[PDB]
PDB file of N, CA and C and ligand atoms in Angstrom:
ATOM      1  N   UNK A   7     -66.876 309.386  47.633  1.00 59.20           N
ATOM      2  CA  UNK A   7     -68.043 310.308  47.502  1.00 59.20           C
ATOM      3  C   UNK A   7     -69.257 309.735  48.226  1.00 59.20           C
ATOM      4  N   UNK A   8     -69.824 310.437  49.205  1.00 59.26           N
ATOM      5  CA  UNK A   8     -70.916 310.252  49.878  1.00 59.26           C
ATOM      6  C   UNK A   8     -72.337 310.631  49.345  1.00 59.26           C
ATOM      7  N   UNK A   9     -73.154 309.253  49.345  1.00 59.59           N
ATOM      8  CA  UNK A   9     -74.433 309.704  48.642  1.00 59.59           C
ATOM      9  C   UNK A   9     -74.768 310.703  49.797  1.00 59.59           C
ATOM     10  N   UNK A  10     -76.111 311.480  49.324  1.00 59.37           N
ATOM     11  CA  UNK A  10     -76.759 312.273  50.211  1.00 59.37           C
ATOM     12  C   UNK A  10     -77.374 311.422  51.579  1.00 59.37           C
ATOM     13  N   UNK A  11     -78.154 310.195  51.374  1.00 59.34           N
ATOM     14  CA  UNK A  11     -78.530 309.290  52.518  1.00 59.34           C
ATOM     15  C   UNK A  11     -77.167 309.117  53.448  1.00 59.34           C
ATOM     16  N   UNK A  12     -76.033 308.880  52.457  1.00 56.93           N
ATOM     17  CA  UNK A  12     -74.676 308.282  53.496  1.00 56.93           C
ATOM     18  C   UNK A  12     -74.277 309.881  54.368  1.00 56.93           C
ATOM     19  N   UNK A  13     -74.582 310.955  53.516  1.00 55.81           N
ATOM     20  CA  UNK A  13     -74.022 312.029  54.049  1.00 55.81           C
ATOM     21  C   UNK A  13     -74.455 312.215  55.397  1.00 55.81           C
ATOM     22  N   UNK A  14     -75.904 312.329  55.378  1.00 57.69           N
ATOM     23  CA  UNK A  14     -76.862 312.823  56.366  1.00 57.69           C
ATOM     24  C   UNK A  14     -76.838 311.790  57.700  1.00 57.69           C
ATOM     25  N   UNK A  15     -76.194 310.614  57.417  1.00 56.47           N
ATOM     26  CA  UNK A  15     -76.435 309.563  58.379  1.00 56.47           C
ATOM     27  C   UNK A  15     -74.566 309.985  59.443  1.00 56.47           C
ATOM     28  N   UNK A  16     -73.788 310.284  58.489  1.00 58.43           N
ATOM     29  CA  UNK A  16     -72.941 310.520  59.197  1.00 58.43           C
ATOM     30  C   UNK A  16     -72.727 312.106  59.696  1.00 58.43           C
ATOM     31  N   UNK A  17     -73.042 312.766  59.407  1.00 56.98           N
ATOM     32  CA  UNK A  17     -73.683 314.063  59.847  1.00 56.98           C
ATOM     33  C   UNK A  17     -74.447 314.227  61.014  1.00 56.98           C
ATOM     34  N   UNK A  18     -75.363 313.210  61.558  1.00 54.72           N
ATOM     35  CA  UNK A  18     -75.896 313.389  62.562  1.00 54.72           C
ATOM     36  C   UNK A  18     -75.123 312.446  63.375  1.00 54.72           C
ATOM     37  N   UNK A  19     -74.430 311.270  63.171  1.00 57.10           N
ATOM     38  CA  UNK A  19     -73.389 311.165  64.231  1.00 57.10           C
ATOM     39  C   UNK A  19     -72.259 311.637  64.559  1.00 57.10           C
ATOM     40  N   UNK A  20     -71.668 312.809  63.743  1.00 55.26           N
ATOM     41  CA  UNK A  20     -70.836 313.843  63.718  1.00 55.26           C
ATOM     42  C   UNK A  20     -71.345 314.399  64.324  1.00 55.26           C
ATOM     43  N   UNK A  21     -72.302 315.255  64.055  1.00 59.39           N
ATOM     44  CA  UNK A  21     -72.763 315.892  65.596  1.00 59.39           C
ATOM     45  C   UNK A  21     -73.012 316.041  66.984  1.00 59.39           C
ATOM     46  N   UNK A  22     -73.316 314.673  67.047  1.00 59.18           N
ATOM     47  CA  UNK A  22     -72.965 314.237  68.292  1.00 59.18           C
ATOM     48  C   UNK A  22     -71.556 313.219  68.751  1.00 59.18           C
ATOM     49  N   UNK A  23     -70.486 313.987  68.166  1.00 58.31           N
ATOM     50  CA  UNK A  23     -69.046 313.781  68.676  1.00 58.31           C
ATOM     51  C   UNK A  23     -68.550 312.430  67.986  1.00 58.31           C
ATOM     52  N   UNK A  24     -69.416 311.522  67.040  1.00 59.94           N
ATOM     53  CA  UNK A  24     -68.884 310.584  66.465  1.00 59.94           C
ATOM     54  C   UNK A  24     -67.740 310.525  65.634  1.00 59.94           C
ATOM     55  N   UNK A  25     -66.217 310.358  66.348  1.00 59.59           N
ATOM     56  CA  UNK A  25     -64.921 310.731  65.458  1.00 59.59           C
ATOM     57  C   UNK A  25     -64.975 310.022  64.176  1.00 59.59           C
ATOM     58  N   UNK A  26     -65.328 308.774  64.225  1.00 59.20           N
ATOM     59  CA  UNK A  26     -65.428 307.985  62.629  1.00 59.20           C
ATOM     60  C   UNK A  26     -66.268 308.316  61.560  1.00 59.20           C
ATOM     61  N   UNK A  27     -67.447 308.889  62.135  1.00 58.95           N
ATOM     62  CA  UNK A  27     -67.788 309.560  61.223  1.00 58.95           C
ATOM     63  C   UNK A  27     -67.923 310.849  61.015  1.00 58.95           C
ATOM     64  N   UNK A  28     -67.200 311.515  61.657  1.00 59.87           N
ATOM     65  CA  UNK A  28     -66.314 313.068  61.158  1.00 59.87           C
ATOM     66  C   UNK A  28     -65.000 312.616  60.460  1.00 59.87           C
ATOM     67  N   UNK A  29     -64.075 311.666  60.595  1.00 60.89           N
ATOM     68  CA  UNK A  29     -63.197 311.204  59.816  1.00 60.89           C
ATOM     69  C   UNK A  29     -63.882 310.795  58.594  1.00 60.89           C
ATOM     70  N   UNK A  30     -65.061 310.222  58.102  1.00 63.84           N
ATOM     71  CA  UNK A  30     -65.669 310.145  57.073  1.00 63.84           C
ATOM     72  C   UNK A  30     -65.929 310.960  56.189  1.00 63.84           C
ATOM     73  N   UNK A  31     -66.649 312.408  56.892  1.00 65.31           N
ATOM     74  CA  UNK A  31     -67.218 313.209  56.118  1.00 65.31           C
ATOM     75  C   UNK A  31     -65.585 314.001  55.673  1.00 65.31           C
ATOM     76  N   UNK A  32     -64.650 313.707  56.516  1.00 64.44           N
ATOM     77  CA  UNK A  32     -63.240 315.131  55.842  1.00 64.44           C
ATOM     78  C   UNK A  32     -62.740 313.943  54.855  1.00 64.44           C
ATOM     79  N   UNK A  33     -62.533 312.854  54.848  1.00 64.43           N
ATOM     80  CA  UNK A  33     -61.873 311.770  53.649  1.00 64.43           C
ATOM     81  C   UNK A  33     -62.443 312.332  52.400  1.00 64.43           C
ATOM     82  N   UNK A  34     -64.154 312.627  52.292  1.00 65.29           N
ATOM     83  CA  UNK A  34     -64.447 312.692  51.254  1.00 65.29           C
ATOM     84  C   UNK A  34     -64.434 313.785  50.663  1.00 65.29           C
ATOM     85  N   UNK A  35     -63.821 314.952  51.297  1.00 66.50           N
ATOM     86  CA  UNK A  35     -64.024 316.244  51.259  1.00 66.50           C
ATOM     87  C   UNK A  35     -62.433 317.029  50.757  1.00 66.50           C
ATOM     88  N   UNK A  36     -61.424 316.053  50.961  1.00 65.06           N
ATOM     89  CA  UNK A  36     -59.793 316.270  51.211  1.00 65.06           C
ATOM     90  C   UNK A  36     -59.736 317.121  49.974  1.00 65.06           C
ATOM     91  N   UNK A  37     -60.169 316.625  48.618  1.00 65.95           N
ATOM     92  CA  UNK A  37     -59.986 317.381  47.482  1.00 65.95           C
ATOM     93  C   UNK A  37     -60.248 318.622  47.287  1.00 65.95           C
ATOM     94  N   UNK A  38     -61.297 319.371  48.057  1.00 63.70           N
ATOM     95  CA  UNK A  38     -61.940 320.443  48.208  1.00 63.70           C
ATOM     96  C   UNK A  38     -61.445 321.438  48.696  1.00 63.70           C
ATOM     97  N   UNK A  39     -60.421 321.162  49.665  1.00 65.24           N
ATOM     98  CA  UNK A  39     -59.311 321.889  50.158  1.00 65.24           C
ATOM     99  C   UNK A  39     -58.388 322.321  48.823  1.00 65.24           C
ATOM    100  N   UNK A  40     -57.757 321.484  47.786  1.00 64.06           N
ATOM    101  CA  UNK A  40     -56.965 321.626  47.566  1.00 64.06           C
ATOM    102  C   UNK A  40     -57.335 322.533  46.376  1.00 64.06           C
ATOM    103  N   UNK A  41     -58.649 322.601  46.064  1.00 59.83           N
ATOM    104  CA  UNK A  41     -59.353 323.051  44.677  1.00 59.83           C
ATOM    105  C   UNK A  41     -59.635 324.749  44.847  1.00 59.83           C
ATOM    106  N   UNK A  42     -60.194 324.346  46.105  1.00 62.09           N
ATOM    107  CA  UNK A  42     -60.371 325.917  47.474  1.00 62.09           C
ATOM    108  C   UNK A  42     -58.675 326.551  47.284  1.00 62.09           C
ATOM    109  N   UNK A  43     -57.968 326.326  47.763  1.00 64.73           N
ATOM    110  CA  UNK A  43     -56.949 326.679  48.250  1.00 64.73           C
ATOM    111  C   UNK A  43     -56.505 326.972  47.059  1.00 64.73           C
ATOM    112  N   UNK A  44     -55.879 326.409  45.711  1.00 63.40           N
ATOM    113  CA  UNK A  44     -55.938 327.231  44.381  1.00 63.40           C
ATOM    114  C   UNK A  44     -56.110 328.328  44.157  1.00 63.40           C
ATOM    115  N   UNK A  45     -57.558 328.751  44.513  1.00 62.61           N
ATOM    116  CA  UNK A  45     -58.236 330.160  44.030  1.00 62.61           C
ATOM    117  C   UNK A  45     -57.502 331.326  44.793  1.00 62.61           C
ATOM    118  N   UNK A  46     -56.651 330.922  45.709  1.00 64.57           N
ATOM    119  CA  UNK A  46     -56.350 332.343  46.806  1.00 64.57           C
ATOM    120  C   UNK A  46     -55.182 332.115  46.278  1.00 64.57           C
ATOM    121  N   UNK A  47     -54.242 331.705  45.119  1.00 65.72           N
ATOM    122  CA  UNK A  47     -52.650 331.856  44.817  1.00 65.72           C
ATOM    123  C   UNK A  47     -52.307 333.311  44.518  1.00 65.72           C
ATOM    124  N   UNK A  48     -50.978 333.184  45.151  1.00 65.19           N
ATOM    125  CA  UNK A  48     -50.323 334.756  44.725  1.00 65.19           C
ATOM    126  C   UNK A  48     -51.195 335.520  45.476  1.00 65.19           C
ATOM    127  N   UNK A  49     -51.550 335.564  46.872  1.00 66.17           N
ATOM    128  CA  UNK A  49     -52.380 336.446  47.775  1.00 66.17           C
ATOM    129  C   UNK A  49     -51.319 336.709  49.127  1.00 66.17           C
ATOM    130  N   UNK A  50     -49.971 336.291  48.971  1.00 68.24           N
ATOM    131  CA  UNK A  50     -48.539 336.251  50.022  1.00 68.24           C
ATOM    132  C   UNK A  50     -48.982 334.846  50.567  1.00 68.24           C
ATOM    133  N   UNK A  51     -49.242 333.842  50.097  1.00 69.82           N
ATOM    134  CA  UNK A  51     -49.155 332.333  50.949  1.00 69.82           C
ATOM    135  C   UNK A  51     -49.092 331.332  49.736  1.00 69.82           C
ATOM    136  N   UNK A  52     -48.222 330.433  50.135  1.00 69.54           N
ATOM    137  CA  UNK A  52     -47.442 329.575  48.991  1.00 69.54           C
ATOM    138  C   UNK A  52     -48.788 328.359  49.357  1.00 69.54           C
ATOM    139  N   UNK A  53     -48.860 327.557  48.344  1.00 67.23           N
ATOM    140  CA  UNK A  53     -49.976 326.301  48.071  1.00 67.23           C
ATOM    141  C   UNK A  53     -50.316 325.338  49.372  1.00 67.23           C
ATOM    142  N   UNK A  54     -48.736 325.528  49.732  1.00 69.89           N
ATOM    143  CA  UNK A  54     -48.867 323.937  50.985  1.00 69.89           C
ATOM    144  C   UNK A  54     -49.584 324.852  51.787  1.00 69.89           C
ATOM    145  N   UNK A  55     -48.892 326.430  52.030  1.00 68.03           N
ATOM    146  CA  UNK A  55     -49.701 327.159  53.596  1.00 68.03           C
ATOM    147  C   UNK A  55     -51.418 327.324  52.815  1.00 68.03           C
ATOM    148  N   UNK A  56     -51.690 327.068  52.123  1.00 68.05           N
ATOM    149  CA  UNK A  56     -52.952 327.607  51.751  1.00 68.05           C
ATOM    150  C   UNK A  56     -53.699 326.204  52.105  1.00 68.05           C
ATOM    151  N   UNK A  57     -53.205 324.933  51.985  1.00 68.38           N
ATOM    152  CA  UNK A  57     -53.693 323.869  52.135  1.00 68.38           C
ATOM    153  C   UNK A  57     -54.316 323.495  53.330  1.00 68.38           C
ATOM    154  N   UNK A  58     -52.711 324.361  54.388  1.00 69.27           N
ATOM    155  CA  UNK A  58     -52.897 323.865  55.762  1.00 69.27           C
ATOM    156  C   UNK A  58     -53.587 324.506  56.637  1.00 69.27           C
ATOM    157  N   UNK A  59     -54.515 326.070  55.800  1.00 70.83           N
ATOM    158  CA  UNK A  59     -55.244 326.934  56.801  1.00 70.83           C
ATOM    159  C   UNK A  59     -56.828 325.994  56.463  1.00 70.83           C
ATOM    160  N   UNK A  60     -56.595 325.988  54.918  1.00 69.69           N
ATOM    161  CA  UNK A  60     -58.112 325.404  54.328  1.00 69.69           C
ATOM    162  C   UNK A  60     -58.086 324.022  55.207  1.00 69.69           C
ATOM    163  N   UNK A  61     -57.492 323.329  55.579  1.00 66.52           N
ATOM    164  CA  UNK A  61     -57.750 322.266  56.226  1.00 66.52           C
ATOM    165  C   UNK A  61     -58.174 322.404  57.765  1.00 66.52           C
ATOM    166  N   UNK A  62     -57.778 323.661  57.931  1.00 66.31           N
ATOM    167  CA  UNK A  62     -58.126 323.740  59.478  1.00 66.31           C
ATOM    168  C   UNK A  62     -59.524 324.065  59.311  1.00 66.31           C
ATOM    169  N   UNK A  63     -60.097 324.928  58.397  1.00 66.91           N
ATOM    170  CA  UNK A  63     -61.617 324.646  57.918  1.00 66.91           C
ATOM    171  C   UNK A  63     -62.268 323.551  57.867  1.00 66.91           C
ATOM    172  N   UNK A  64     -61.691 322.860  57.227  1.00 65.23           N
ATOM    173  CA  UNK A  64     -62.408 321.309  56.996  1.00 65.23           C
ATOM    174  C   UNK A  64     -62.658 320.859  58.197  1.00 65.23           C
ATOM    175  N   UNK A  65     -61.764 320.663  58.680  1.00 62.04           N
ATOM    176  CA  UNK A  65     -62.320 319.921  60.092  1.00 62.04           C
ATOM    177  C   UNK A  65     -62.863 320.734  61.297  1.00 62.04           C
ATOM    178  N   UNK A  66     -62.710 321.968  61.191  1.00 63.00           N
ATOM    179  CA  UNK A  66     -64.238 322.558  62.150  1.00 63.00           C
ATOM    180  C   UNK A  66     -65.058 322.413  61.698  1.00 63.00           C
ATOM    181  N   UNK A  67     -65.142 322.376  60.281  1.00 65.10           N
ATOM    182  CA  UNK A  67     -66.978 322.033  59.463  1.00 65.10           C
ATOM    183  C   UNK A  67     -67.380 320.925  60.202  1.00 65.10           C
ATOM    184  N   UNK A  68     -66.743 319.771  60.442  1.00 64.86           N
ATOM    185  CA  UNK A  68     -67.274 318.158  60.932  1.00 64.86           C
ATOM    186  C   UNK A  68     -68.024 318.903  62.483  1.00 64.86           C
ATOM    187  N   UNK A  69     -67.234 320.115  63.093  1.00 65.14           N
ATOM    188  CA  UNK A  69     -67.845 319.541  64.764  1.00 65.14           C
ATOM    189  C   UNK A  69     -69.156 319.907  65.020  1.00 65.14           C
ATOM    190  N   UNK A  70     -69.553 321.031  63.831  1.00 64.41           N
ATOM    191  CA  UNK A  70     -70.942 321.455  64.200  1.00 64.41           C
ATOM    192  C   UNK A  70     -71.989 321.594  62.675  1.00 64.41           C
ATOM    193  N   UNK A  71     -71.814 320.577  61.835  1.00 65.52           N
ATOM    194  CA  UNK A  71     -72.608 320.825  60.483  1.00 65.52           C
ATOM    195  C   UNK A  71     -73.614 320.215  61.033  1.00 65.52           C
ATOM    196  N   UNK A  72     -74.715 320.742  60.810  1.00 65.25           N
ATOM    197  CA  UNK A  72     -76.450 320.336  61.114  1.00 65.25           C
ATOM    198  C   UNK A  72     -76.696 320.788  59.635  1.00 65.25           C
ATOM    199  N   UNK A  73     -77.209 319.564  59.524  1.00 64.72           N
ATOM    200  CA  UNK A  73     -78.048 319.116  58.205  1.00 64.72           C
ATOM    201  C   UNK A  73     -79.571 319.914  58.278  1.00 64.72           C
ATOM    202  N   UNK A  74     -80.320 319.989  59.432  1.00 62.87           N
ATOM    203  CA  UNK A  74     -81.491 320.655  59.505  1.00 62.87           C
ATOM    204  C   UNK A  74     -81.330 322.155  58.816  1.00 62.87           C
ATOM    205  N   UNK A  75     -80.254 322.742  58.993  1.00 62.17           N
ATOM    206  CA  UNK A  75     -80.129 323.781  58.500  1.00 62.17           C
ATOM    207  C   UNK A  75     -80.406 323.955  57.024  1.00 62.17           C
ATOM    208  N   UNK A  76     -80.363 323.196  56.312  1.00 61.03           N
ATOM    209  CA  UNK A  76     -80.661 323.040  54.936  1.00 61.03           C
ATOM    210  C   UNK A  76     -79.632 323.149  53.708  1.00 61.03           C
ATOM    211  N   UNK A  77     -78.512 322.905  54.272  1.00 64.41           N
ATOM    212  CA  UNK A  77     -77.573 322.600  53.571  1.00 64.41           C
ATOM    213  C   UNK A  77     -76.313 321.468  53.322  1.00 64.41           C
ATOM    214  N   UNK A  78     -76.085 321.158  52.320  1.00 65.48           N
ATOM    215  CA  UNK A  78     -75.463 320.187  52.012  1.00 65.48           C
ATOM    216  C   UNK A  78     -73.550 320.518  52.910  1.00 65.48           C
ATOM    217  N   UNK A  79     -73.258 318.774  53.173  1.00 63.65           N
ATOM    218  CA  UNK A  79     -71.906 319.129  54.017  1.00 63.65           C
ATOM    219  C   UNK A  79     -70.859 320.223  52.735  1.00 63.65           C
ATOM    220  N   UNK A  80     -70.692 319.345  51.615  1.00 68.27           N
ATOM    221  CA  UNK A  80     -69.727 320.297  51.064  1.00 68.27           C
ATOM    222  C   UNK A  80     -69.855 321.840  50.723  1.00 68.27           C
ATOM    223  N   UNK A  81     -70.749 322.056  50.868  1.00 69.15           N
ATOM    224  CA  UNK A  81     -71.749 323.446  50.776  1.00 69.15           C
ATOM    225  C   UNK A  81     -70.900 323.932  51.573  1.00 69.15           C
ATOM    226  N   UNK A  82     -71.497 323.540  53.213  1.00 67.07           N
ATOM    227  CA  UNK A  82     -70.866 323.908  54.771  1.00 67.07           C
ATOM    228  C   UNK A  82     -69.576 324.119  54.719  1.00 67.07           C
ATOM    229  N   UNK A  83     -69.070 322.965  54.390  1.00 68.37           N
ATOM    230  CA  UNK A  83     -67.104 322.654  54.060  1.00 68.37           C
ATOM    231  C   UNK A  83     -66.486 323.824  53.296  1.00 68.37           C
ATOM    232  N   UNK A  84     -67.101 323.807  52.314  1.00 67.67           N
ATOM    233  CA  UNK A  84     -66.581 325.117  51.173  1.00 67.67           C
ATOM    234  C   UNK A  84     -66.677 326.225  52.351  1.00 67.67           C
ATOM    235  N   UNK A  85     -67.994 326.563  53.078  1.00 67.13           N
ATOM    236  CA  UNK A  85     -67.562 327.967  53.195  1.00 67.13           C
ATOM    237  C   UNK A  85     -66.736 328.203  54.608  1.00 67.13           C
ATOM    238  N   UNK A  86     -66.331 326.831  55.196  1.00 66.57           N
ATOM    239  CA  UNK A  86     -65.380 327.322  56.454  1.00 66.57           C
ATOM    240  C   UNK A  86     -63.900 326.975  55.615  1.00 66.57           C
ATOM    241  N   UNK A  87     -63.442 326.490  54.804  1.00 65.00           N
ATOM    242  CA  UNK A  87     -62.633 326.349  54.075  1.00 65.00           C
ATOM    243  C   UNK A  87     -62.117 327.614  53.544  1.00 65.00           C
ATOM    244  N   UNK A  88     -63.245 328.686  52.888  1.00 67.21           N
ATOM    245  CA  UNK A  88     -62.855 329.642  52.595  1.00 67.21           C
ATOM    246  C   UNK A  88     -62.458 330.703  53.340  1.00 67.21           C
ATOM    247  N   UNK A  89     -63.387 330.432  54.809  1.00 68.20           N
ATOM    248  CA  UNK A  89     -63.052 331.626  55.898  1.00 68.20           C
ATOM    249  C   UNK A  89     -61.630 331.441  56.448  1.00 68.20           C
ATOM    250  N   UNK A  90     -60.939 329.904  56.789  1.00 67.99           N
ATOM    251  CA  UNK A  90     -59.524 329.685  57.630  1.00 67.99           C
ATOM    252  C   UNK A  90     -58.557 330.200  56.528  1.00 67.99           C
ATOM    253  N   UNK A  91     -58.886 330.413  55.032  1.00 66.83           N
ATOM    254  CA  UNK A  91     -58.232 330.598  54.299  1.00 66.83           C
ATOM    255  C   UNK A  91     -57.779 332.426  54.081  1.00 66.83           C
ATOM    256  N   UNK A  92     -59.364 332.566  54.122  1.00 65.33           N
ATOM    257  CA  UNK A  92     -59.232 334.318  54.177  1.00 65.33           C
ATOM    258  C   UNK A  92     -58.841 335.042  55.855  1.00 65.33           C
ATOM    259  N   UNK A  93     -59.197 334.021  56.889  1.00 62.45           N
ATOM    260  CA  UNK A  93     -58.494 334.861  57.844  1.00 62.45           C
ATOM    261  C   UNK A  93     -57.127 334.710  58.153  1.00 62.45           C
ATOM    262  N   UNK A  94     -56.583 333.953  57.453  1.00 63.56           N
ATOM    263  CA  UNK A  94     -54.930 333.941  57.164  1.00 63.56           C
ATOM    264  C   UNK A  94     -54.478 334.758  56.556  1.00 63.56           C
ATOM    265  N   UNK A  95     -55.232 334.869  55.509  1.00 62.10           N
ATOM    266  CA  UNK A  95     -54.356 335.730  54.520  1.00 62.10           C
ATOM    267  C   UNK A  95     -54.769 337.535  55.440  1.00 62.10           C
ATOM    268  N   UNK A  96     -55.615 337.390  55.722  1.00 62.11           N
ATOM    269  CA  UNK A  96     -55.939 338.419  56.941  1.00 62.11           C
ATOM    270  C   UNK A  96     -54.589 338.660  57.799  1.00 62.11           C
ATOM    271  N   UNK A  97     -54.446 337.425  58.676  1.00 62.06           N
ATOM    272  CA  UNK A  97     -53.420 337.802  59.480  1.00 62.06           C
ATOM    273  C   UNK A  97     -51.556 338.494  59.015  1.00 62.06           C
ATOM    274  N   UNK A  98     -51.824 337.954  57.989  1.00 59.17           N
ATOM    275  CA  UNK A  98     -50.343 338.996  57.094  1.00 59.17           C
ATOM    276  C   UNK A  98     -50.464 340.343  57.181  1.00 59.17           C
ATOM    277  N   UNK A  99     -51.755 340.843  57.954  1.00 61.23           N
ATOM    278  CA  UNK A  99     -51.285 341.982  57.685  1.00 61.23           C
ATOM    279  C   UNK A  99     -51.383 342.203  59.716  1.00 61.23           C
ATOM    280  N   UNK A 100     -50.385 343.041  60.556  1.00 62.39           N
ATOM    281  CA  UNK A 100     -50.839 342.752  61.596  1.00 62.39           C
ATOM    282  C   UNK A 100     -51.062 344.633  62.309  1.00 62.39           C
TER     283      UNK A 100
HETATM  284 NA1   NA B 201     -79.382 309.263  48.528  1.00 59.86          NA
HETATM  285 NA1   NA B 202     -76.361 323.034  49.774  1.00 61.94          NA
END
């Protein structure tokens, strides 16, 4: 768990393409996927596929979260987490 000082420090070197600390901010975040991904059961996608769209969220959150914006990373995380999740379940239908 990242204090807010640790957050913000790796946040702005995430932004500017720092992989270690975009590998930082998704380590602390891994659970969030799986808590996320829960809430959409029984929507036609079994747990692991729900894991593996919410994760593709997670890690676009790292390439462009700006802290100036005024929000916290898991804030950010949650809501691209929820979008890779809902445009999957989107794509079931074609
Ligand atoms: Na702090
Ligand atoms: Na926030």
């Amino acid at each position: 768990l990242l204090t807010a000082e640790e957050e913000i420090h790796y946040a702005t070197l995430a932004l500017k393409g720092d992989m270690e600390a975009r590998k930082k901010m998704i380590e602390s975040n891994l659970r969030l996927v799986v808590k996320i991904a829960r809430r959409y059961l029984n929507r036609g996608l079994p747990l692991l596929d729900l894991i593996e769209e919410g994760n593709l969220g997670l890690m676009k959150s790292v390439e462009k979260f700006d802290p100036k914006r005024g929000f916290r990373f898991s804030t950010y995380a949650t809501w691209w987490i929820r979008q890779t999740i809902e445009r999957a379940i989107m794509n079931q239908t074609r």
